[PDB]
Structures are given as C-alpha cells and as structure tokens.
C-alpha cells in the first residue's frame, strides 16, 4: 500500500540487513508542473510557451527549478508565485543506519534520500516520476562520512534536480 | 515449484508492486528440437546435418522455426510433420496488470507474455530456455501502446523466436522501454528485435526505446534489428504510422537511443536497422559468418564502427553494406 504524504519520513538507527520492497510514494497535493518540451520531444525555448503548458499534474513535467529561470528568461515573472518554487514531493529517509537497501522504488512526484548512512543503496525500479526533491540522494550531513554507498540497477524519469547524487 | 502445462496460464488483476519470484515453466510434452551448430558451437549450414541432430529435448537446440526453413533450404521437407507446426510452450501470461515484475525467470520451453501491460519488467532472468512463444514478450497489440516495459539485468538462452521482442511500444518523449544489461543466445529471429513494419491488424512498429550494454551471441539473422519500416506496406498508407508519401520506405523518426552494442556469431547479417534522423554510436560487430551490417538507413550517422572478420563464409559480398546515403565517421 502507498506511502502518502509530503516531506521526509525518517527511520532511525536500523541494523544490518534491513529490506524495503515494493514501495510507492504519492503526494497528497497535486503540484503545478511545467513542461518545457513538445510531443515531438524537442525543447520549448520560448518562456511563454512553457507557461502556456503550465498545469497541475503529478506526472508529465517537473516542478519549477531555479535553473529553469536562468535557462528561459522571463519564465519566473510569468509563472504565478503559487505555481513555482514549491516542494510537494513524497519523500522518505533512512537516518544513521547500516545495511538498509531499498528495492523497487515507485511513485509519482517522489523522492528518496538517506542521511548518515553507510552500506546503503537503491536497487531496481518501477520507473518512478521524480518531484522537486532528488530521486536518489545521499547525505552524511548529520552523521559522519559514508562508505559502501552506491547505486546499481533500475532507472528513473523526471526530477527537478539530480536523480543520483 | 513449477507450473506445468501448455497454452496460456493467465494471471489477471494483480496490483502495483506485485512480485513473481522463482518461477519455472515446463511443458508437459517434450517437443522436437534441432541443433544448427557443431560441438565447437559454430553453425551447420547443411540442411541434412541439422535434421541429423533432430531429437526430442528442451535444451541444446530450439524447435524448428519458419525462418529456419528459409535459412537452410530443403530442411522442411526432410523434417517429419510432428516436428513442424509446433506450439509447445509453457507460457505464463500476465494479462493487463501493472507493477507485476517477473524475477528469476527460468524454465524449459518457457515464455512470459505481458499482454496490455505497462510498467512491468523482466528483472534478472536466470538462464531460461525459450520456445515458440518468446521468453520476454511484450504484446501491446491488444491494449494501448506499451510504456515502461523493460529488460533490466539477466540473460536468456534458446528460443524459436525473438528472446526480447517489442510489439507496439512507444516510450514517448520519456524514451521508456528498452533492453539494458542483457545477453541473448540463439533466437530464431533476432535476439533483440523491434518488429518490422505493421504485423497484425494494428501496428507492431516501435519508437523511442533504449538499447545499451546488450549482447546477442549467435543470432540466426540480426542481433539488433532496430528497424520498423522494412518489407511491410510499400503501398500509400502504412497503418498506425505515417504514410509512405510523408516519409519514404526505410525512413521513420523512430529516435531509438543506440550506444554500446555488441554482436558476435551471426549466421546472417549481424546488425540492421532502418530510419532517418537516427544517431548510432559504438557498434562493434566481429566474428560473424555473415556480414557485419546491412544498413537500410538513409540520413543517419554511424560513429565509431568496427567491422572486423565478418562475411567469412561469403554468403554476402561485403563486410558492410549501406543502401542509402549515410554519414559514417570512422570505420
């Protein structure tokens, strides 16, 4: 069954051999997403055309990024303030743990993160649609520096930021 | 434990995130198989020699194909009636489900057919032996165009048809679907195949699939058949596709993502594709009895191509052939 919500859901201090499988991440609020491309799979370099395709969807687009403001001039001003800069992403975290492997990540407007984690990975996929937060992200920004932290297999689509980091 | 039988064992109404693991599929009857290779794992190109290896087994060969009759002339007449027209495959069909991923697919005379499915994968298949029905078969002829149908990890062996076959799969702008990290052995058509033109009532043409880090060892024909506009519909309308007036024959904007592909052991041509606007890179075809590539493409770019020791039995007239006008940077 789906994990519904927004923002992180932390699981602290798990020992080695933890498994999570078949997880789906759905956002309870449908955000505004932009699509700066066509159905010919070619970019829209006109900023007004990106705003014209502005819609509330949980797929087929990704939430506005500060990087798109630089790339397409005047896109920021045209977009409403409630339709840009938002983070509505159903996100998960494992905090200060060993041996936690996440298998078969799915969702729509989804993300996964880790903090303080060693020996921790993302394996397989159902092809999740990424949101504002990174699809696979590692921190040790509380904790101390990683090791054994890798990514193998699967793939992802969308995202407003890097899908592995 | 196994699932024994022939025909389709139909699984319906399986929700998101469902797993099928450890599956084995075995047919009740033992079908006839032919081995068109030596004991050094080359080829037998003599029809009588392939007939001499005729036996009832589910391994060390695959069932007589219609393509084998064309490939080896006069083989069909020599073969007995019972070894021809076979449909003996133990098939587990997942019909119209989403999130059903078949893990650790094995079997003898096995097939897995995903009908009308979307976002269903074949994840780490462990040495299956194919049959008349393909091991990895995405049939999206029934239902809407397939998207999210992938082969991620694993390998396949044998088969009397394509081991990885895509029927009516459009990945859209996402470029979903494809074959990554795969090894295919002895497909009776082509190891990894996007089907040529319109086959069936609706189109079987494939668009926007990603093929990287894939290996096809010993295909009968092409190892990677990435065409979709070969020998079908020379007439004015091409169903489920752009007209021949809009784009000439052997030209379509398929826009497959083509990098790091390896073909070895091909009896016929090792690589073939058609299309226009295609960008192809890192293709190495070596140690093939037939030609390295027959490229039916026009206005396509082929970069870092190595055709070494192909057409060593001289079925064809060249190591590489390009019918159209293409731009080849490096050879």
């Amino acid at each position: 069954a789906k994990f519904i919500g927004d923002g992180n859901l932390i699981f602290t201090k798990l020992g080695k051999g933890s498994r999570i499988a078949g997880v789906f991440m759905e956002s309870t609020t449908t955000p505004w997403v932009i699509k700066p491309w066509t159905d010919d799979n070619q970019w829209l370099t006109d900023a007004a055309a990106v705003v014209a395709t502005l819609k509330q969807s949980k797929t087929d687009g990704y939430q506005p990024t500060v990087s798109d403001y630089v790339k397409f001039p005047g896109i920021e001003t045209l977009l409403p303030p409630n339709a840009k800069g938002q983070n509505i992403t159903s996100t998960l975290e494992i905090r200060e743990c060993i041996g936690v492997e996440v298998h078969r990540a799915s969702g729509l407007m989804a993300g996964f993160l880790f903090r303080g984690c060693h020996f921790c990975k993302m394996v397989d996929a159902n092809n999740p649609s990424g949101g504002k937060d990174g699809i696979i992200t590692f921190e040790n920004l509380s904790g101390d520096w990683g090791k054994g932290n890798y990514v193998i297999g699967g793939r992802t689509s969308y995202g407003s930021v890097s899908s592995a980091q | 434990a196994k699932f024994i039988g022939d025909g389709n064992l139909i699984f319906t109404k399986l929700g998101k995130g469902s797993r099928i693991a450890g599956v084995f599929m075995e047919s009740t009857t033992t079908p006839w198989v032919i081995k068109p290779w030596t004991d050094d794992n080359q080829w037998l190109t003599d029809a009588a020699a392939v007939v001499a290896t005729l036996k009832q087994s589910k391994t060390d060969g695959y069932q007589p194909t219609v393509s084998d009759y064309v490939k080896f002339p006069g083989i069909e007449t020599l073969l007995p009636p019972n070894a021809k027209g076979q449909n003996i495959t133990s098939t587990l069909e997942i019909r119209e489900c989403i999130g059903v991923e078949v893990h650790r697919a094995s079997g003898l005379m096995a097939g897995f057919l995903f009908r009308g499915c979307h976002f269903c994968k074949m994840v780490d298949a462990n040495n299956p032996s194919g049959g008349k029905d393909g091991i990895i078969t995405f049939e999206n002829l029934s239902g809407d165009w397939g998207k999210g149908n992938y082969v991620i990890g694993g390998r396949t062996s044998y088969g009397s048809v394509s081991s990885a076959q895509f029927l009516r799969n459009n990945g859209g702008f996402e470029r979903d679907g494809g074959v990554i990290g795969f090894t295919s052995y002895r497909a009776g058509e082509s190891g990894v195949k996007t089907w040529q033109g319109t086959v069936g009532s609706t189109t079987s043409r494939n668009y926007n699939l990603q093929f990287r880090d894939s290996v096809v060892i010993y295909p009968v024909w092409d190892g990677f058949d990435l065409g979709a506009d070969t020998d079908m519909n020379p007439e004015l309308d091409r169903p489920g596709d752009y007209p021949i007036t809009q784009y000439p024959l052997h030209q379509l904007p398929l826009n497959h993502l083509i990098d790091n592909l390896l073909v070895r052991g091909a009896l016929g041509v090792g690589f073939g594709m058609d299309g226009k606007g295609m960008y192809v890179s890192n293709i190495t075809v070596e140690d093939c009895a037939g030609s390295g590539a027959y490229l039916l493409t026009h206005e396509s770019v082929f970069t870092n191509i190595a055709i070494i020791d192909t057409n060593t039995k001289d079925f064809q007239a060249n190591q590489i052939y390009i019918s159209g006008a293409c731009r080849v940077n490096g050879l």
Binding site: G17, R19 | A1, G22
Partner: protein, 166 residues
C-alpha cells in the same frame, strides 16, 4: 481475540415468547436467498476438532433445548461459504430468517492454520543452526550469531527455503 458469537451456545426461541423451538428444522443455504429451495440449500458438515470434516444431511434438527443436534449429540456445524439460516418450528411456520451468518472462528486449527499463515522458524527458538535448518519448511530467519569451525555442514533436507539474515 475480539471475536465472539451472539449466543455463547446457539439457542433458538420463538419470536414473541421465550420458549425453545421443539422439533424444528433449520435450512442452511446461500446468503440473501431463501434456503427452502434445494438449489440454494447447501450441504452442512460437522467440524471435528481433530481436523476432520464429515458430510451429513442438509437440514439440522432442533431438539427441546433449542440447540442444534445431529446423531443425538451436540454438534458444531460449519459450511464452506457464508450461509443463511432459517429457523422453522414444528408447524413449519418461519420463526426467524437470518440472511447473513459469517464467522472467522478457526477452531480445530490443525487444517486451518496451515492455509491462513506462513511459517518461518527463528534461530532463537533452537540452540543450533542445524536444528533450525531441519525445522525450516518454508522460511528461515537468522536473528542472532552462530559460531562455526573449519568443516561444519548444515543440511536443509532438500527443502526450498527463503533465508533472511539480519
């Protein structure tokens, strides 16, 4: 647990008087349909706590205590599906009609517990991995440390096992 029947011992009484139904018949059949018809009417089984099911005639006999009786003894009657119960008195008049009778009660619990649960043996319930290996019929769980030496063989008996090491 939290599951309990309305009558701790099944007893049937007249609609507007508290007196047991004497020489009544009970027709057990498919839910939300009259069990009078033989087509709707279903065969009823005596559930033995041993783990056996035996088939008896479809109507149940009501004694003078208002309780179910078959073979001159109090029996525990079960069906293979959700059933409807229709209480009839000695004049054949319909005292009560219950369209839905469904219960989860697994008692016996020899046949039932195989089908409704999964089995995994925990290493903590055995002193050695060898004992937990032979006691693993499906799952195996390693929740604690195990010592071993050069040349120590553990046998699973040819059983197919999904092993989970934590």
């Amino acid at each position: 647990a939290n599951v309990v029947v309305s009558n701790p011992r099944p007893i049937f009484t007249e609609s507007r008087s508290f007196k047991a139904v004497a020489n009544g018949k009970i027709y057990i059949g498919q839910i939300d349909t009259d069990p009078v018809n033989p087509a709707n009417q279903i065969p009823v089984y005596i559930e033995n706590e041993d783990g056996s099911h035996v088939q008896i005639t479809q109507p149940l006999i009501i004694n003078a205590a208002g309780k179910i009786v078959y073979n001159g003894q109090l029996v525990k009657i079960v069906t293979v599906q959700g059933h409807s119960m229709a209480i009839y008195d000695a004049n054949g008049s319909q005292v009560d009609y219950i369209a839905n009778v469904l219960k989860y009660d697994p008692d016996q619990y020899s046949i039932e517990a195989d089908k409704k649960f999964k089995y995994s043996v925990k290493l903590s319930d055995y002193p050695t991995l060898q004992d937990a290996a032979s006691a693993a019929v499906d799952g195996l769980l390693i929740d604690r440390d195990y010592n071993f030496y050069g040349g120590e063989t553990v046998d699973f008996g040819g059983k197919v096992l999904t092993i989970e090491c934590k």
